[PDB]
Symmetry: C2
Subunit: 128 residues, 2 copies
């Protein structure tokens, strides 16, 4: 059927909204009681309203945004993407759990680039 | 049926192996031609053999290991976990794609802790 492709459509629009700084559009995808976790800091945000207000406040719209990859099966979705402010990018992961077509739980990680180490160069492909 | 639960069983064993530094057991889960990507560095590792040798070499067995959460649907799996060396932990994400019960593509991210910022304290729950 269309179920996964419908989620993927919603996700494409979500990320477009995020790049565009359309905070309303960016939060359309969430259940009202959606939770958003940052495990790196132990923080949990409760509710679509709170999530939108917090994001809109800071850091606000990214200066740079690009989706790397979106994978999903059933109600489990994961988006790999880059966001950047001040010429400092973050390799970002958003793990989303859906119910009835809406996000009920998002978990985000924000990671730094690192240099491919010389020692294993002979054994890796550089794919970007 | 049992399909997902069978993958989850394999994953539990995978991570136990990783904590234990059992590099053989740790690599049982992969297809022979499995690829492992580090998007933060643009590196791709091709093959179970290469992946095992590289991991075994450096950084080798973690001084500290703990699974945070495992989610999965069908052939898409994502493990959130912590690894630590020298009292420096990394909030890690491993995204795994399965085919016929074996990992064909893993993508890993290694992220730092960050302090929950004061400004949004009134609006977040600290869950750890
Ligand atoms: Ca409600
Ligand atoms: Ca082969």
């Amino acid at each position: 059927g269309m179920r996964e492709e419908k989620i993927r459509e919603a996700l494409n629009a979500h990320w477009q909204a995020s790049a565009a700084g359309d905070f309303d559009a960016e939060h359309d995808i969430y259940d009202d009681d959606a939770i958003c976790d940052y495990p790196q800091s132990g923080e949990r945000i409760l509710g679509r309203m709170n999530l939108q207000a917090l994001r809109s406040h800071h850091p606000g719209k990214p200066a740079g945004f690009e989706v790397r990859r979106i994978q999903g099966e059933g109600n489990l979705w994961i988006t790999e993407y880059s966001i950047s402010y001040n010429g400092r990018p973050a390799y970002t992961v958003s793990i989303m759990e859906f119910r009835n077509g809406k996000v009920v739980h998002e978990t985000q990680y924000f990671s730094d680039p690192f240099e491919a180490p010389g020692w294993r160069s002979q054994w890796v492909q550089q794919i970007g």
